[PDB]
Amino acid sequence: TYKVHYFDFTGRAEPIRMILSYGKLDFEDVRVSREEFQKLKPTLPLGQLPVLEFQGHMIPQSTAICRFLANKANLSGKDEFENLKIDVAVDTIEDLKKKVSEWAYEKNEEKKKALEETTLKEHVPFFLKKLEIHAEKNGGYLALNRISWADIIFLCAYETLGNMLKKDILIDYPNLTKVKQNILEVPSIKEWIKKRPTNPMLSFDLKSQV
Amino acid sequence: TYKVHYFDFTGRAEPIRMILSYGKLDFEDVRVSREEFQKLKPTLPLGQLPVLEFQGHMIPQSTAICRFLANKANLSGKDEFENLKIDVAVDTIEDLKKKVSEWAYEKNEEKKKALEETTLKEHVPFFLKKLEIHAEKNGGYLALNRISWADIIFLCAYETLGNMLKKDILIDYPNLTKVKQNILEVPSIKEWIKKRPTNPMLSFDLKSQV
Question: Do B68 and A81 touch (CB under 8 A)?
Answer without folding.
Answer: yes
